[PDB]
Design a protein around this motif. Sequence first.
Motif, PDB file in Angstrom:
ATOM      1  N   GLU B  55      44.939  40.024  46.551  1.00 57.11           N
ATOM      2  CA  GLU B  55      44.871  40.130  45.122  1.00 57.11           C
ATOM      3  C   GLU B  55      43.495  39.693  44.625  1.00 57.11           C
ATOM      4  O   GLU B  55      42.795  38.911  45.272  1.00 57.11           O
ATOM      5  CB  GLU B  55      46.040  39.361  44.480  1.00 57.11           C
ATOM      6  CG  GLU B  55      47.356  40.148  44.582  1.00 57.11           C
ATOM      7  CD  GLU B  55      48.584  39.501  43.915  1.00 57.11           C
ATOM      8  OE1 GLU B  55      49.582  39.226  44.625  1.00 57.11           O
ATOM      9  OE2 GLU B  55      48.601  39.300  42.681  1.00 57.11           O
ATOM     10  N   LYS B  58      39.484  41.658  38.190  1.00 56.99           N
ATOM     11  CA  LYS B  58      38.205  42.255  37.762  1.00 56.99           C
ATOM     12  C   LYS B  58      37.592  41.466  36.605  1.00 56.99           C
ATOM     13  O   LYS B  58      38.259  40.689  35.895  1.00 56.99           O
ATOM     14  CB  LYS B  58      38.378  43.709  37.283  1.00 56.99           C
ATOM     15  CG  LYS B  58      38.648  44.729  38.367  1.00 56.99           C
ATOM     16  CD  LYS B  58      38.190  46.132  37.933  1.00 56.99           C
ATOM     17  CE  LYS B  58      38.998  47.212  38.648  1.00 56.99           C
ATOM     18  NZ  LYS B  58      38.360  48.556  38.621  1.00 56.99           N
ATOM     19  N   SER B  62      41.516  42.966  34.727  1.00 63.00           N
ATOM     20  CA  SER B  62      42.468  43.842  35.395  1.00 63.00           C
ATOM     21  C   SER B  62      42.826  43.231  36.742  1.00 63.00           C
ATOM     22  O   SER B  62      41.960  42.734  37.449  1.00 63.00           O
ATOM     23  CB  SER B  62      41.850  45.233  35.645  1.00 63.00           C
ATOM     24  OG  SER B  62      41.410  45.839  34.463  1.00 63.00           O
ATOM     25  N   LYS B  63      44.097  43.331  37.099  1.00 63.90           N
ATOM     26  CA  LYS B  63      44.605  42.755  38.319  1.00 63.90           C
ATOM     27  C   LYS B  63      44.614  43.811  39.409  1.00 63.90           C
ATOM     28  O   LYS B  63      45.068  44.910  39.188  1.00 63.90           O
ATOM     29  CB  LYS B  63      45.993  42.195  38.074  1.00 63.90           C
ATOM     30  CG  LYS B  63      46.074  41.168  36.960  1.00 63.90           C
ATOM     31  CD  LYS B  63      45.116  39.997  37.175  1.00 63.90           C
ATOM     32  CE  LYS B  63      45.299  38.854  36.145  1.00 63.90           C
ATOM     33  NZ  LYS B  63      44.884  39.256  34.772  1.00 63.90           N
ATOM     34  N   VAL B  64      44.075  43.469  40.575  1.00 61.83           N
ATOM     35  CA  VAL B  64      44.002  44.384  41.680  1.00 61.83           C
ATOM     36  C   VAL B  64      44.858  43.845  42.826  1.00 61.83           C
ATOM     37  O   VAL B  64      44.781  42.649  43.165  1.00 61.83           O
ATOM     38  CB  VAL B  64      42.562  44.655  42.159  1.00 61.83           C
ATOM     39  CG1 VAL B  64      42.555  45.700  43.279  1.00 61.83           C
ATOM     40  CG2 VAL B  64      41.741  45.165  41.011  1.00 61.83           C
ATOM     41  N   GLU B  78      46.649  49.075  44.050  1.00 63.92           N
ATOM     42  CA  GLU B  78      47.112  49.159  42.685  1.00 63.92           C
ATOM     43  C   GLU B  78      46.180  48.377  41.742  1.00 63.92           C
ATOM     44  O   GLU B  78      45.755  47.248  42.056  1.00 63.92           O
ATOM     45  CB  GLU B  78      48.513  48.591  42.588  1.00 63.92           C
ATOM     46  CG  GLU B  78      49.526  49.352  43.405  1.00 63.92           C
ATOM     47  CD  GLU B  78      50.875  48.658  43.448  1.00 63.92           C
ATOM     48  OE1 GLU B  78      50.992  47.538  44.026  1.00 63.92           O
ATOM     49  OE2 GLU B  78      51.825  49.233  42.883  1.00 63.92           O
ATOM     50  N   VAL B  79      45.874  48.976  40.611  1.00 72.27           N
ATOM     51  CA  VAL B  79      45.158  48.313  39.550  1.00 72.27           C
ATOM     52  C   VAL B  79      46.118  48.220  38.367  1.00 72.27           C
ATOM     53  O   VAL B  79      46.779  49.189  38.009  1.00 72.27           O
ATOM     54  CB  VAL B  79      43.892  49.064  39.137  1.00 72.27           C
ATOM     55  CG1 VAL B  79      43.088  48.269  38.108  1.00 72.27           C
ATOM     56  CG2 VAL B  79      43.032  49.385  40.354  1.00 72.27           C
TER      57      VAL B  79
END
Lengths: 250, 250
Positions: B55, B58, B62-64, B78-79
């Motif tokens: 994990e 950004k 934004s969570k990646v 997944e973003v």
Amino acid sequence: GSHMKNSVSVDLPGSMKVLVSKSSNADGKYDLIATVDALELSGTSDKNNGSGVLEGVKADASKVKLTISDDLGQTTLEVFKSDGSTLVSKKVTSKDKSSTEEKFNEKGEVSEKIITRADGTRLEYTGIKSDGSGKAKEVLKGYVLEGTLTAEKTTLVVKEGTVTLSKNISKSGAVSVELNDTPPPPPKKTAAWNSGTSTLTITVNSKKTKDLVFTSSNTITVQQYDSNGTSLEGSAVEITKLDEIKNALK
Amino acid sequence: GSHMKNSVSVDLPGSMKVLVSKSSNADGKYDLIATVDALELSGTSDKNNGSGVLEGVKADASKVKLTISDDLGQTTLEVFKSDGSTLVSKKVTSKDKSSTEEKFNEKGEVSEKIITRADGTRLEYTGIKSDGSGKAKEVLKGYVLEGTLTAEKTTLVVKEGTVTLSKNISKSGAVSVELNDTPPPPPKKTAAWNSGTSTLTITVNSKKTKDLVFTSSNTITVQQYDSNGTSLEGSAVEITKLDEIKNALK
């Protein structure tokens, strides 16, 4: 030909000549004789220019009558049956070289007619019926037009492919022309899809033209049929450009 | 790129690598870090082959999330939005080099999709709607097919003149192909008759082609128009044979 004592030959419309006596007979009339289609016709007229009426009997007992107008500008030649009244043929001819030939029927009615115009062109009607209809032909300088007659008009027809041209001639002699074109539906490209083979078979004019194969490798190939649409020719060629697909759709 | 003390680099589906620690931490787990689109992702897994979940956040919050399957045969990237749950993009990639890229909408629903097949060909869907419809494009080796998507199928279209070819792809991936041709009505020859001038004017494709004149001397002449159908060219030629009339009717 015809011979007469102390006579003069007079030229008549439509080839014919009549001899007319230099002097009058006991009754003051002048003697006329003529030879038409090897038959001698004879008569007496009050006039002395060649006009009058001449009559003759054929070997089959048909009665022939030649009437020459006062001015020598018209001959009427009639052939009758034995009875002297049921017409068979009638030919009116003019000095300008124009004429009408009629042939008659059992009922006393016209069944053929040739119209000759001054310039040498003709209209020929054959097989004329009770209702006024018949076959028709215009003879022109260098060619012939075919068609039919009705009571109202003559209709001459020329055909080229699906194109019909009609020349109409009314009873007054007025020309009017029309054209028709019934073109066939254009060549349409249909196709049938075989899912078992992943193949599209394209057809034109009830001939198969080409196979498009949609391959398991996400490519297209094209292959042509023989120009009888019977079976495939060459080998399958692989499509690498969009334009080649468009090309195979032409 | 990514650096880790006493690690091993492991190559992953779709370009990526993950570093996994040579040893376990205080809890028995292994450390994973990876660098994707210049963002460092980190996590701990019970496994030590490179599988697990990493994990990162950004700079726009934004969570990646990168999920690597147990067998290393699949990566899911997944973003998400800030909230960590509203999807933005999702990319599932396989070892055979196949993949699915989805982009999502405000409603939590897929609005673009790129399907990459093992062989490198692609299907691209853009502008997908609530009803399942959208724009569509198949990318093939050497060219691109355009069309649209419905809920039931993708329909790629190639056009040549009045000919339409359609490639349909069902949800199972089954191909079926059809063809349509809507050919225009063929060129028909019409005509108009001027009785004042005794002239027939023939027309094709809304261009006058020729005048047929029916003369007072019982002859026909033909004359052509300029190829714009604007006015007459040459001089009138006289018809002497039937074949010449047929010819002018071609």
